Amino acid sequence: MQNRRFEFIEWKLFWEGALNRSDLEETFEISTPQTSIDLRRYRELAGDNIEYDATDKTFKPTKGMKPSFLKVSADRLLLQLRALLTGALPRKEIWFREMPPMDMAPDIVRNVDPECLRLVLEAIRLKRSVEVRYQSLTNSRVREIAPHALAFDGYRWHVRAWACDRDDFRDFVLTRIDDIKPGSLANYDPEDDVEWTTVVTLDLRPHPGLTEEQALAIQRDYSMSDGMRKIDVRLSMAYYFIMRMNLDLEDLPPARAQLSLHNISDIRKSISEAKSESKRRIIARQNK
Template sequence: MYKSGITDLRKKMSIQFTYDAIQRFHFIELIIYWEGRLTTNHIQQHFQISRSSASKYIQDYLTFFPNFLIYNSSKKGYEASNKFVSKHGLNDLGTYLKVTQQSMTSHFYNNFTAMVSPLAPIEPSKVSEILNALKHKYRIDVGYASVSSPEFESRIISPHSLVFDGTRWHVRAYCEKNRDFRDFVLTRFNGECVIEGRAEFDQKNDTLWQKILHVSIEPDPRLTPNKARIIALDHQMVEHPSGQYKRVIKTRAALLLYLLKQLRVDSYQANPEAQQIILSPYCLAQLQPYMP
């Protein structure tokens, strides 16, 4: 048993756990998680490699995670064992579609379409220095324009996080003009930046970033029971003993407005079929201090 353990260790050491290896393992887990069956053909098509190389990729995965996959001879492929645990994050369907469509050529994969932000892509020249400040925790002087101040004006900020709200990219930063943490839309920077030393404020100082809220949603009570049940299915709600459907979503207080817009509960619709979901009344009261 000891010799077997040494052999397994040597096998693992012979496989370089590089970025490429992580990408291969991620792809394997995506196929297992979403399709339920992995074959060498999946890997051959995606990575444009030979069958023998594809088999080696699977064996490399099994060397690191020996009990995660089992071969099903009737399906002629691998499937997850009851010990399978994702190591690379798999529960986002969008990630699966994006990764598998990169080089898949079969007709099946041409049947997927993912909506992306309709806004123009961000120019790298406008944000490269912002990204540099995030990486090195710099305090920087930048030019920024807003709806209230349409001309570019100097802002000294200490950025700590990038945020994508589903449509636009923002950077969360401490603003010395407002003496508070604010969200800045990346496209509104002019690209010119002066480093002013090390940042004095970061995530730990951002109270709204650190505060976790629990957002409870439920079907609009004006809907019929059958319609409410369908809406509950759409939003993965749980039926409670009282017969009500609810779901609780965790978010940072700093990101609450973005979540409410995504859920379309930031405004009220006269038509219940258009409204579909509402914030639970008790939840709405708790969220009031964090809403604009």
Template sequence: MAFIEFRLQWDGRINRQDVAAKFDISLNQATHDLVRYKRLAPTNIRYDLSERAYLRSHDFAPRYDITGVAGYLDQLEAASKGTSRDGAFWIGRWPAFEVLPAPTGEIGLDVLRAVVASILANEPIDVLQQTSDELAPTWCTLLPHALVHDGERWCVRAFSCCAGGYETTPLARIGSFRAATAAIGPAQADADWNTMLSLEIGPNPALPAAAREVVARDYGMEDGKSILQVRHALVGSLLRRLGITEIPTEHAKLVLLNPEALGLLGEHA
């Protein structure tokens, strides 16, 4: 049902061949599915004899979240990463589009699999990781508990025996792994991970009024601000990604409206 609605929403039309080809079903079954959707949402779909297809009605109102803006743009972004457009996506007619590439380090399949297994089993693992303190990679025992995407790269959140506390480590820095050579007792709770903060961001008041309005629309603000829920451990990554500094420059787009939520910015940046 969601696929039918997706095609109506974004292509404006669908026929039984589309449904049959997508799900490898008979034309009769595809017709049955289209009739079912028409019963479910009669004001969304109409059959056009001349087109020999079902068309989006003028009173179309989507019922499934996946057929909305985020669902469509997510498919464009996924397609930009080289995934074949055959079979994996619901888009029928592709618009011209471009997504800017971002440099990312390679994450080893075996490394990710081992880290995921360690998280699921709540067991430590030794990793050979590159750090900014040593020229050569060094071994360290980690007790990972979560995967993290910081807006730019995938990381692992773990208790680190080397650091004597919790760290967020980019997975691309891990070159190899082995069974843990050191036992780790029950680690203290990851307080920075468990603490959620509400950060209020708004347009830089130093910007002209028109520019502030543009920023507000770009970032989906209401009443001049957006409220973001973020883990304390990830505050620094979020602020860097948004270009928010303790003392904003006159050209900065965004500012933090409630710095008291996290104390001194410098401690978390």
């Protein structure tokens, strides 16, 4: 608990440049005696990481500040702000005294039914089916499915499931389930979903039609080393990532793609192999 108060001290010193005793009392429900104890024990242990400005009556970081308790990370903080903007993280867990002005891109899909999600979660947990009326892109029909995982593509949640009427694994968009009922026992093993369990590396590069000035900017945004960034992804998610990034669209102007997927052919081939390998495992299990 006290170490958390020292990371807080250092968080205030690093990102906000100043610390009051009242910051600790208000954020951690500690007494002013305890606050004086923590600053002293902190000063004893971090040395001249902290200084007292008698003018502002605040504690300030020294020029030599080396965090000793706090692992400083911009990506963790920026990620933490997003959790606040979506309401997933309450304001009390964000240590800013003053929040920076900010916004994010609205999430469009929402309004998931709790009972739908409850029944889906029960089926996953119990390794059971559910009967669903599912609106696909090709038809509405009643189907029995056995959920095994949840996947978020960046916009929508889908359930990864055994399709009981097809003896294969497929994705079902949660918002496209229009009626849901508890089902029966499905005989399947999730280890047979080779498209789910296989991880592949995406080979992302600047779009070959970019100029050096364009290519240098793209390399910096996506932290490329040696002109590329490798990203491991499940084959099931690689599809969503490829389509979402329009890496399937070959005729796009260079400035909109920014990226190319150098190994897109192997990924497409691997998806086809995963579906075929899955079928072989399914049949071999059903025959045992």
